Amino acid sequence: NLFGEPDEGIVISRFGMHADVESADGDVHRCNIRRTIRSLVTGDRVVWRPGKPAAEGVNVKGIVEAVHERTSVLTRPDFYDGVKPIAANIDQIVIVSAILPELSL
RNA sequence: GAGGGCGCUUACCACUUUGUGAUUCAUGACUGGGGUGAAGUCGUAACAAGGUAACCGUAGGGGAACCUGCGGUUGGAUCA
Ligand SMILES: [Mg+2]
Ligand SMILES: [Mg+2]
Ligand SMILES: [Mg+2]
């Protein structure tokens, strides 16, 4: 409760119980997520509110309320896990490989 | 004179000092795990004969669940 300003920002990473949310200028600010969110991936623009600082200048987390629509999505299914999206909202993929340990085709 | 007092000295001895142990708390860089986490990643181990029967003890291997070797058990299916 006691949430802040609704704004648009880019989610840095995913940690299950919470996520790292970059603001509109480059501020690393970790936030937890809303219970009704079906999925949240790396680099997905969201609507979020950065809580409220209990101490003056010292805040713990905010919340991520809503998730914007997906431009692209990287969904890969799995045995006994179902279809899980990995990342979203991307224009280019770079397949990176190495000769060691193997280079398959 | 007898005797007493003062004073001095000795014995006992608190406090105190050094050397060096035992014990306890606070702090402590660092470090060992373990627990709590519904949606994160990695895999599919076990529960059916769970797709190499599983488990216990021990040795070795490797991100990991685990795997191999030896021995034992049925808390194993199917089997005469
Ligand atoms: Mg298995
Ligand atoms: Mg098995
Ligand atoms: Mg055996």
Side-chain angles (χ1 to χ4, degrees), chain A residues 31-105:
Chain A
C31 297
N32 60 7
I33 64 171
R34 178 65 66 192
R35 302 281 81 81
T36 62
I37 299 299
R38 61 187 184 273
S39 178
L40 182 60
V41 297
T42 296
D44 195 0
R45 59 183 178 90
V46 295
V47 177
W48 59 277
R49 294 176 69 186
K52 187 179 290 294
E56 184 68 28
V58 178
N59 194 359
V60 177
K61 287 185 263 75
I63 199 165
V64 176
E65 290 182 351
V67 176
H68 293 285
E69 294 293 327
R70 293 180 179 91
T71 300
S72 66
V73 70
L74 187 63
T75 60
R76 295 178 67 89
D78 195 0
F79 291 100
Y80 297 102
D81 289 331
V83 175
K84 290 183 180 179
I86 296 171
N89 293 318
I90 195 162
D91 292 332
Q92 188 178 4
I93 301 168
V94 176
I95 297 170
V96 178
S97 296
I99 196 66
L100 292 177
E102 288 182 352
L103 182 62
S104 177
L105 295 176

Side-chain angles (χ1 to χ4, degrees), chain A residues 5-21:
Chain A
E5 182 179 1
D7 54 353
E8 183 179 1
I10 301 169
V11 176
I12 296 170
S13 180
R14 173 76 268 177
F15 296 103
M17 285 66 252
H18 58 278
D20 195 359
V21 175

